[PDB]
Scaffold this motif. Structure first.
Motif, PDB file in Angstrom:
ATOM      1  N   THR A  17       0.851  -1.022   0.033  1.00  0.00           N
ATOM      2  CA  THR A  17      -0.073   0.257   0.182  1.00  0.00           C
ATOM      3  C   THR A  17       0.839   1.143  -0.039  1.00  0.00           C
ATOM      4  OG1 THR A  17      -2.018   0.993   0.987  1.00  0.00           O
ATOM      5  CG2 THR A  17       0.019   0.291   2.398  1.00  0.00           C
ATOM      6  N   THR A  18       0.114   2.445  -0.230  1.00  0.00           N
ATOM      7  CA  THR A  18       0.944   3.488  -0.274  1.00  0.00           C
ATOM      8  C   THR A  18       0.524   4.462   1.037  1.00  0.00           C
ATOM      9  OG1 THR A  18      -0.669   4.249  -1.846  1.00  0.00           O
ATOM     10  CG2 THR A  18       1.576   4.297  -2.663  1.00  0.00           C
ATOM     11  N   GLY A  19       1.295   4.987   1.821  1.00  0.00           N
ATOM     12  CA  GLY A  19       1.174   5.760   3.066  1.00  0.00           C
ATOM     13  C   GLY A  19       2.165   6.742   3.602  1.00  0.00           C
ATOM     14  N   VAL A  20       1.984   7.357   4.539  1.00  0.00           N
ATOM     15  CA  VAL A  20       2.652   8.290   5.022  1.00  0.00           C
ATOM     16  C   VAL A  20       2.658   8.549   6.547  1.00  0.00           C
ATOM     17  CG1 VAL A  20       1.556  10.432   5.269  1.00  0.00           C
ATOM     18  CG2 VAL A  20       3.834  10.775   4.522  1.00  0.00           C
ATOM     19  N   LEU A  21       3.933   8.888   7.035  1.00  0.00           N
ATOM     20  CA  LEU A  21       3.844   8.798   8.600  1.00  0.00           C
ATOM     21  C   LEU A  21       4.293  10.310   9.039  1.00  0.00           C
ATOM     22  CD1 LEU A  21       3.603   7.954  11.431  1.00  0.00           C
ATOM     23  CD2 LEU A  21       5.983   6.876  11.304  1.00  0.00           C
ATOM     24  N   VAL A  22       3.755  11.106   9.718  1.00  0.00           N
ATOM     25  CA  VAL A  22       4.164  12.708   9.999  1.00  0.00           C
ATOM     26  C   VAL A  22       4.439  12.331  11.351  1.00  0.00           C
ATOM     27  CG1 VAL A  22       3.246  14.864  10.251  1.00  0.00           C
ATOM     28  CG2 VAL A  22       2.709  13.531   8.311  1.00  0.00           C
ATOM     29  N   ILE A  23       5.573  12.971  11.822  1.00  0.00           N
ATOM     30  CA  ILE A  23       6.146  13.034  13.175  1.00  0.00           C
ATOM     31  C   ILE A  23       6.302  14.553  13.414  1.00  0.00           C
ATOM     32  CG2 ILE A  23       7.862  12.386  14.637  1.00  0.00           C
ATOM     33  CD1 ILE A  23       6.559  10.068  14.115  1.00  0.00           C
ATOM     34  N   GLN A  24       5.939  14.973  14.717  1.00  0.00           N
ATOM     35  CA  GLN A  24       6.226  16.059  15.100  1.00  0.00           C
ATOM     36  C   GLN A  24       6.924  16.415  16.436  1.00  0.00           C
ATOM     37  OE1 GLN A  24       2.759  19.057  14.822  1.00  0.00           O
ATOM     38  NE2 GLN A  24       3.761  20.340  16.478  1.00  0.00           N
ATOM     39  N   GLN A  25       8.205  16.987  16.461  1.00  0.00           N
ATOM     40  CA  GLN A  25       8.833  17.364  17.701  1.00  0.00           C
ATOM     41  C   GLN A  25       9.048  18.937  17.715  1.00  0.00           C
ATOM     42  OE1 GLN A  25      11.641  14.065  16.238  1.00  0.00           O
ATOM     43  NE2 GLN A  25      12.057  14.174  18.503  1.00  0.00           N
ATOM     44  N   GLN A  27       8.118  22.372  17.168  1.00  0.00           N
ATOM     45  CA  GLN A  27       7.364  22.888  16.103  1.00  0.00           C
ATOM     46  C   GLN A  27       7.711  22.424  14.844  1.00  0.00           C
ATOM     47  OE1 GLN A  27       4.518  25.131  17.096  1.00  0.00           O
ATOM     48  NE2 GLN A  27       4.840  24.063  19.130  1.00  0.00           N
ATOM     49  N   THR A  28       8.529  21.378  14.795  1.00  0.00           N
ATOM     50  CA  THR A  28       9.132  20.976  13.709  1.00  0.00           C
ATOM     51  C   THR A  28       8.402  19.629  13.023  1.00  0.00           C
ATOM     52  OG1 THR A  28      10.817  20.122  14.818  1.00  0.00           O
ATOM     53  CG2 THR A  28      11.174  22.271  13.404  1.00  0.00           C
ATOM     54  N   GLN A  29       8.020  19.234  11.769  1.00  0.00           N
ATOM     55  CA  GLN A  29       7.393  18.000  11.345  1.00  0.00           C
ATOM     56  C   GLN A  29       8.137  17.377  10.213  1.00  0.00           C
ATOM     57  OE1 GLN A  29       3.482  18.903   9.947  1.00  0.00           O
ATOM     58  NE2 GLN A  29       2.444  18.692  11.983  1.00  0.00           N
ATOM     59  N   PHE A 212       2.276  12.156  16.398  1.00  0.00           N
ATOM     60  CA  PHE A 212       2.388  11.332  15.035  1.00  0.00           C
ATOM     61  C   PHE A 212       1.151  11.129  14.407  1.00  0.00           C
ATOM     62  CE2 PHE A 212       1.972   7.935  18.193  1.00  0.00           C
ATOM     63  CZ  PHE A 212       1.063   7.236  17.697  1.00  0.00           C
ATOM     64  N   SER A 213       1.240  10.807  13.282  1.00  0.00           N
ATOM     65  CA  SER A 213      -0.186  10.399  12.571  1.00  0.00           C
ATOM     66  C   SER A 213       0.180   9.584  10.939  1.00  0.00           C
ATOM     67  CB  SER A 213      -0.874  11.606  12.004  1.00  0.00           C
ATOM     68  OG  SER A 213      -2.159  11.424  11.387  1.00  0.00           O
ATOM     69  N   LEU A 214      -0.340   8.148  11.492  1.00  0.00           N
ATOM     70  CA  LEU A 214      -0.056   7.569  10.065  1.00  0.00           C
ATOM     71  C   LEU A 214      -1.586   7.525   9.310  1.00  0.00           C
ATOM     72  CD1 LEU A 214       1.248   3.803   9.774  1.00  0.00           C
ATOM     73  CD2 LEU A 214      -1.138   4.091   9.779  1.00  0.00           C
ATOM     74  N   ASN A 215      -1.071   7.440   8.019  1.00  0.00           N
ATOM     75  CA  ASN A 215      -2.212   7.557   7.042  1.00  0.00           C
ATOM     76  C   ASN A 215      -1.763   6.803   5.998  1.00  0.00           C
ATOM     77  OD1 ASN A 215      -3.158   8.784   4.426  1.00  0.00           O
ATOM     78  ND2 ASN A 215      -4.658   9.626   6.127  1.00  0.00           N
ATOM     79  N   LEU A 216      -2.521   5.898   5.525  1.00  0.00           N
ATOM     80  CA  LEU A 216      -2.370   4.939   4.654  1.00  0.00           C
ATOM     81  C   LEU A 216      -3.676   4.615   3.772  1.00  0.00           C
ATOM     82  CD1 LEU A 216      -3.448   2.382   6.111  1.00  0.00           C
ATOM     83  CD2 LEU A 216      -1.085   1.877   6.637  1.00  0.00           C
ATOM     84  N   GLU A 217      -3.402   4.057   2.466  1.00  0.00           N
ATOM     85  CA  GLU A 217      -4.820   3.638   1.847  1.00  0.00           C
ATOM     86  C   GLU A 217      -5.277   2.308   2.235  1.00  0.00           C
ATOM     87  OE1 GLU A 217      -4.707   4.514  -2.483  1.00  0.00           O
ATOM     88  OE2 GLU A 217      -5.737   2.592  -2.847  1.00  0.00           O
ATOM     89  N   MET A 218      -6.381   2.280   2.944  1.00  0.00           N
ATOM     90  CA  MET A 218      -7.310   0.928   3.169  1.00  0.00           C
ATOM     91  C   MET A 218      -7.388   0.092   2.196  1.00  0.00           C
ATOM     92  SD  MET A 218      -6.279   0.514   6.349  1.00  0.00           S
ATOM     93  CE  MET A 218      -7.261  -0.380   7.625  1.00  0.00           C
ATOM     94  N   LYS A 219      -6.571  -0.629   1.599  1.00  0.00           N
ATOM     95  CA  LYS A 219      -6.570  -1.635   0.385  1.00  0.00           C
ATOM     96  C   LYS A 219      -7.704  -2.476   0.898  1.00  0.00           C
ATOM     97  CE  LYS A 219      -3.290  -0.247  -2.453  1.00  0.00           C
ATOM     98  NZ  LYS A 219      -3.557   0.829  -3.633  1.00  0.00           N
ATOM     99  N   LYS A 220      -8.403  -3.029  -0.071  1.00  0.00           N
ATOM    100  CA  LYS A 220      -9.300  -4.295   0.191  1.00  0.00           C
ATOM    101  C   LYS A 220      -8.566  -5.339   0.640  1.00  0.00           C
ATOM    102  N   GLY A 221      -9.070  -6.002   1.659  1.00  0.00           N
ATOM    103  CA  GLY A 221      -8.671  -7.343   2.322  1.00  0.00           C
ATOM    104  C   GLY A 221      -7.376  -6.869   3.098  1.00  0.00           C
ATOM    105  N   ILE A 222      -6.824  -5.721   3.004  1.00  0.00           N
ATOM    106  CA  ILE A 222      -5.802  -5.368   4.056  1.00  0.00           C
ATOM    107  C   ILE A 222      -5.870  -5.489   5.496  1.00  0.00           C
ATOM    108  CG2 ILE A 222      -6.213  -2.959   4.448  1.00  0.00           C
ATOM    109  CD1 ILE A 222      -2.899  -2.586   3.396  1.00  0.00           C
ATOM    110  N   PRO A 223      -5.214  -6.076   6.209  1.00  0.00           N
ATOM    111  CA  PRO A 223      -5.531  -6.031   7.689  1.00  0.00           C
ATOM    112  C   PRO A 223      -5.608  -4.810   8.509  1.00  0.00           C
ATOM    113  CG  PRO A 223      -3.671  -7.808   7.197  1.00  0.00           C
ATOM    114  CD  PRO A 223      -3.935  -6.698   6.016  1.00  0.00           C
ATOM    115  N   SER A 224      -6.694  -4.666   9.359  1.00  0.00           N
ATOM    116  CA  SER A 224      -6.636  -3.561  10.232  1.00  0.00           C
ATOM    117  C   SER A 224      -5.232  -3.229  11.064  1.00  0.00           C
ATOM    118  CB  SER A 224      -7.893  -3.585  10.994  1.00  0.00           C
ATOM    119  OG  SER A 224      -8.310  -4.913  11.311  1.00  0.00           O
ATOM    120  N   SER A 225      -4.822  -4.397  11.449  1.00  0.00           N
ATOM    121  CA  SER A 225      -3.517  -4.472  12.324  1.00  0.00           C
ATOM    122  C   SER A 225      -2.219  -3.799  11.695  1.00  0.00           C
ATOM    123  CB  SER A 225      -3.057  -5.660  12.684  1.00  0.00           C
ATOM    124  OG  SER A 225      -2.544  -6.399  11.468  1.00  0.00           O
TER     125      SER A 225
END
Ligand SMILES: *C(=O)[C@@H]([C@@H]1NC(C(=O)O)=C(S[C@@H]2CN[C@H](CNS(N)(=O)=O)C2)[C@@H]1C)[C@@H](C)O
Length: 241
Positions: A17-25, A27-29, A212-225
């Motif tokens: 899948t395609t996703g991103v993870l944003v980390i903030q410490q 005031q910088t991301q 943090f905020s993880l954002n990915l595309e929930m593909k069909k059949g992908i596990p929620s874990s």
């Protein structure tokens, strides 16, 4: 350095899948993953809106932390939703019905005003107060989700200190190796393509907060874990865990 972010790109890749993870410490991301453009892209908040949903309801006395929302007995999409729950119990189980009830108590008038006052996403909740976070016009980028979590973690949101401390307790997950972890998962399947969320923050032993905020595309059949797995694995590879 750049090697730590190469494994993260593979983490989203090995999940197909395609996703991103944003980390903030501070005031910088910083963004990580295979689709870094997702960090500045708006998606429906889905169950992550429950964080703000609970803040508005408690601040305006729409509900209490000890109030019990009795289950009507009708079958639900998940077995964890088939029980009487307080606002805190409904938060961990992500019970849409309980927070739809709360959203109806708040009302479109107060809900739209409070969302704009805080500046959540595009701040457009439409006219239906019980579905704007799943399919409605309300959209938010992962950057804004991490910024929101960092402010809630430090109790700097435009809500009372009491209410922010109560919602914080609803999002507490665990303490792994001295680090207290708070997070709220999300999954909006009623939008195409589906979106997966995992927004929260870490309180390191010395008190430092890492949102943090993880954002990915929930593909069909992908596990929620996968959402929780990629997030925990990434923070470990980032030295945060
Ligand atoms: C919100 O995104 C959506 C809910 N929320 C979630 C979620 O990602 O947690 C799901 S998926 C399902 C819900 N309960 C399980 C996790 N909580 S648990 N294990 O019971 O403690 C996974 C679902 C789509 C809306 C409908 O609220």
């Amino acid at each position: 350095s750049d090697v730590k972010a190469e494994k993260i790109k593979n983490l989203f890749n090995e999940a197909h899948t395609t996703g991103v993870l944003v980390i903030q410490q501070g005031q910088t991301q910083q963004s990580y993953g295979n689709d870094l453009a997702r960090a500045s892209t708006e998606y429906v908040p889905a169950s992550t809106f429950k964080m703000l949903n609970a803040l508005i309801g408690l601040e305006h006395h729409k509900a209490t932390t000890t109030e019990v929302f009795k289950w009507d007995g009708k079958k639900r999409l998940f077995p964890e939703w088939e029980k009487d729950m307080t606002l805190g119990d409904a938060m961990k189980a992500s019970a849409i019905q309980v927070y739809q009830d709360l959203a109806r108590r708040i009302g479109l008038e107060l809900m739209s005003k409070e969302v704009k006052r805080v500046g959540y996403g595009n701040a457009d909740i439409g006219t239906q107060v019980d579905n704007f976070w799943l399919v409605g016009p309300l959209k938010i980028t992962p950057q804004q989700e991490a910024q929101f979590a960092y402010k809630l973690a430090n109790k700097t949101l435009p809500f009372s200190q009491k209410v922010q401390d109560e919602v914080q307790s609803m999002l507490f997950i665990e303490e792994k190796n001295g680090n207290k972890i708070y997070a709220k998962s999300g999954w909006g399947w009623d939008v195409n393509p589906q979106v997966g969320w995992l927004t929260g923050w870490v309180v390191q032993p010395q008190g430092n907060i890492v949102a943090f905020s993880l954002n990915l595309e929930m593909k069909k059949g992908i596990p929620s874990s996968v959402r929780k797995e990629i997030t925990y694995k990434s923070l470990e590879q980032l030295g945060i865990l």
